[PDB]
Symmetry: D2
Subunit: 343 residues, 4 copies
Amino acid sequence: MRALAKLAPEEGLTLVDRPVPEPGPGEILVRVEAASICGTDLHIWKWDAWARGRIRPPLVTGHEFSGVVEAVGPGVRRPQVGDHVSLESHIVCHACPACRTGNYHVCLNTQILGVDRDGGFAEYVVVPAENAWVNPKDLPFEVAAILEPFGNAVHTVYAGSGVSGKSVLITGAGPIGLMAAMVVRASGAGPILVSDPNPYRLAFARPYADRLVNPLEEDLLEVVRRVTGSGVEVLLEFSGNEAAIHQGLMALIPGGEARILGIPSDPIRFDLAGELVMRGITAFGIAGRRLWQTWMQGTALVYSGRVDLSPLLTHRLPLSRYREAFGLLASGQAVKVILDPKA
Amino acid sequence: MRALAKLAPEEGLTLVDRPVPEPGPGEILVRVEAASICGTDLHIWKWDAWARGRIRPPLVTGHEFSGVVEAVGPGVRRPQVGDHVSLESHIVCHACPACRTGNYHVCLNTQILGVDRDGGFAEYVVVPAENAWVNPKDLPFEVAAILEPFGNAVHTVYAGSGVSGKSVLITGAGPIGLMAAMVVRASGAGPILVSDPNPYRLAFARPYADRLVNPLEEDLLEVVRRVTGSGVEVLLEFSGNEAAIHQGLMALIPGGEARILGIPSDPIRFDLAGELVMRGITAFGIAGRRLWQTWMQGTALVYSGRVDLSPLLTHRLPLSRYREAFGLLASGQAVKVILDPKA
Amino acid sequence: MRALAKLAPEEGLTLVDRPVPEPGPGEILVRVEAASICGTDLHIWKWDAWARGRIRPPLVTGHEFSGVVEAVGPGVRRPQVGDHVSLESHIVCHACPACRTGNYHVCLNTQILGVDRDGGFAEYVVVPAENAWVNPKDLPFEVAAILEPFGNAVHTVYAGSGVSGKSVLITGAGPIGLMAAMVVRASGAGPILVSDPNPYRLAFARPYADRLVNPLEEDLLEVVRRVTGSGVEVLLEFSGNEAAIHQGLMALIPGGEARILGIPSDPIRFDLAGELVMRGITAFGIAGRRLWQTWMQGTALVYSGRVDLSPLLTHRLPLSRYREAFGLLASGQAVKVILDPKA
Amino acid sequence: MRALAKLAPEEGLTLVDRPVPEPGPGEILVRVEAASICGTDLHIWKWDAWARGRIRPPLVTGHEFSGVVEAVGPGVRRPQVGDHVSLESHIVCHACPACRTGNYHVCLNTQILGVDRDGGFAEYVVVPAENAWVNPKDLPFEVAAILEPFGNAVHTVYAGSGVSGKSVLITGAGPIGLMAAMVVRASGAGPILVSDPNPYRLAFARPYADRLVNPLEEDLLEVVRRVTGSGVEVLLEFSGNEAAIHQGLMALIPGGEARILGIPSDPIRFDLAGELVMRGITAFGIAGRRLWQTWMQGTALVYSGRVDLSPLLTHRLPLSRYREAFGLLASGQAVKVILDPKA
Ligand SMILES: [Zn+2]
Ligand SMILES: [Zn+2]
Ligand SMILES: [Zn+2]
Ligand SMILES: [Zn+2]
Ligand SMILES: [Zn+2]
Ligand SMILES: [Zn+2]
Ligand SMILES: [Zn+2]
Ligand SMILES: [Zn+2]
């Protein structure tokens, strides 16, 4: 089969041919129909600091994908051959304290498909049977392929007190932030403010947000004061940019909540007293997807039509042309790019 | 000044002339621009048991109204003359276990506007300044007049775990239940099911629900099963109808939540163990509006446009044609009737 | 081995000799060191209505027990041979909506050890590997044997808003109610009131409760008003007695919580409006133990010494003398009776 | 009347004579029976930056006091002459986003007793009637005097998911952290770990903690590991010490909660991604006392006897010997110092 791999400790990826993996007990073989690309994949590709401390070549990458269950291992009762599925990238241990608590999304021994073991940028991939989420047969694979990143948005948005009937500020219009914009709008947030310095990304958030802000042309804190009268009740942070983080926290009203998915590249200077403790703020560290309630909430929204992810699918390319694909992503000229492993 | 009052211990109300009242300390004088009527007012109309043991004539009725701050009492600094406001009907004592605990919606010393003291079915009314909710000048008074009953819906929907990304069954398509349908739809619930025997009421929910059900014509359970695959996660009960209550609980998946606003006219037969305990169901008794939180969530929905309450106002009549307003009520025909105290 | 069984659709149980069960994939063989008896077992014994609709002879009963892992099935990584364990009686399916939600305690396909399949009133018993909770080797088996019923108390007490710094009323001094009395006292509840008509049971609650009440000699509602000044914030109901339920709910303050574990023998007449909806009460149906957080909280309390269950172990008898054992229980002359299968 | 005041922009305080103030509308006149001092008072004492940008002489300091209602203002009906009361130092505006939302503890217009206006370091003080908490006549005034700072602890412990049945690490054994230790012990936490370099402070917690740790002498992490098997579920931070903050977060299991009352004197270096985001940690900024809830939980603990605050009062000095009280403070020696304004 065809597969995109990182064969050595350097830049780029390579198209190779590998035998079809085989599912043993508790596993299933999945025929990949669509897969997507995100920041993690871009770290691997550029072979930067992050990638260097986490990746161990050889590795077939790809952690955002959907396909059909082509085979199951001995004893696997579910899913079943023929089922259409989306995949949870985190493989949890079930033998640590986080798992005991039900906090699977932060399992101490978390292993990630396409990062720690072979992923979905291939025609076939073997994953744990418990990691498969069966979708309605009419759900387009393309959309099914991006439920994983969508989950991140969902998790962030519904963490804490949620967003229904509350003012919200989203800092970062990257793909997950655009997705969170769709979710807060379909959840009854209002007013909704989305802030991002890149025009191309902001635009994508226009049909959902009530006010778009380019922190580099308007004083975010002041637009917020004029839109709400003071501050927002909720801050959803997806960029990791330190100045946005500080601005965003200053934007919260006392007693508010900041939910943080964004990963800053370096430690930040933080005024614990001023930005959190003294104003009674609660900061939520968001990681992964809550195992099963995040998937339940998110697929509920998509299956029923409360949200429509389609406009986020800016490009479709055969896996063969992966280079053009990463290029588009890397340049900010795309939101969700789909790769087809059959071509 | 024209006012509509219950002058003696009997059915009906009487159109009267009273001098314009004056606000003392801590009070304001509202020039009412719009009022609405609901079941409570009906109880007072027909002078039934309830009214009998509660109303003390002479009394200007009405608790659902909006208007303008004509003048304030000495030392009152909020709201201000010229402010457009809606009224919270519950006047809380601030001196009971319920208020201390922050459960003002259930103050044991609750004094209701229009039942225990003069209400808004008049050109002017004096009320506690703390009961006034200031609205943007551009919100129609007609809509502002129904924010109180809308709050009841809001309170029921956001109670417990909310409804975002969840399957919801709403029993009762009367005015409040209908507002609930608008809210759960704008809050991202899905699938959304609404059940009520009256096809008139049920049709108002078509643009908000995913599935409409007349339980007298279809098996509600079998329909819930076909739409969700089993049960709903949330039950929102507005009818107080015993059969609907029993059926709704059965449609709830184990571990789900039932939030009850509906008041049955008589005790029900309840299999505590089978309908609640053994299935791990939690039942929420909803009453009033959480003081200020319910108003914040609801008005945010309205102000931002997440929900549009216009479709619920079927009739606007002059206060002097009240005989007909109370008839529409007792009959069913309308959803929410507005009364114009200036005519 | 020795085992206590229900061999036919009638009263009583029978001592028999059966081969030692064998653990297959995903299972473990447990050598039982101690087991206890409760109401469920008494239903089976008396072969009453309940038992008749649930039991299917032949059945080795016993669902409250602890022992040592004597053997594990092929592939079972944990627990391990030699481990000391307590057992969760509920065997969950992992393929229903409750399980999906994490509400394992109300799994639609729940199977119960000692009720639906052979239990612990035997020298040996095979249970699912995932149902074993490993205890510190120095925890006395006797105490380990009663962690299952303890969990019920724990679940009830920590459901909702918990009990820390709140007035609590416990109706029912049966064994789980006494256990809940120990837990609310070790949790910072205050004042704590325990009410039960049986003197022998009340007494057991004296070192934990702040006020003991015999509803049949004092007006429960009035003692409560004098102890708190109005009502309690939390009601923990363990009896299922209808008058206690009504009394208890009347005892709650508006906005309070009632957590119900008690199973009434017959439907009750319930004034939905008066007892729940109008006073903003929230009723929690408690079933089983939350899979893992209930066990985490409860074993934490026991391992650290925050609670000491020992005084509840009123009797110890070899399994051979099971009849005297059930007799004591049936007569209200005991709290937790331990049966030893080795004799 | 004797009072202790900051009369000019400099260090120190001055013992003075003022006429007994009179309560206007909505106010009461408290005859102070006991007052206490904390770090804030110290800031005012040494007149540092903080005090500099906040205090406006002439000002009678003190915010931790208890006393008797000597007389009430016209029309004040609660509390009453003769009532023993404690004072909430925060005077809230009831006109900001924070108050509307019910987050009075963080009112943007908070006016503090003894910092923005006359306090209790005097024989008499006039305060808003709504700030008085009525105590049972038999509670010692000395203990009643420290309910305010105790509330800070209470608020920190019960924030988030509470602590019952959970493993807890408390960093900082100063007065508040020590009160926190008493509360978490009385609330059923276990194992309970308390870390602080000062062996004087640490010894006060011996009767409440399960494990005492001097982090300068032992590796806090390795100790937490040996006591829990991994990490603690809850982190309660009271020191504001950057090193303790970083170490405590590391000791928290993934998905745990950190509740921070501690105010660092300077911004910290914070690895947002590593210490919060990637581990799914939630950090709670705790400030003040939740208005009325914190007081209800705390006083219930005290009134019922779940906690005994007596051990925390090391010294009781006449107000006139304040020079020494402020010395004990700045030095460490004592826990809580009481000042008797009648001498
Ligand atoms: Zn991704
Ligand atoms: Zn794990
Ligand atoms: Zn109404
Ligand atoms: Zn009240
Ligand atoms: Zn049992
Ligand atoms: Zn199940
Ligand atoms: Zn202080
Ligand atoms: Zn305020």
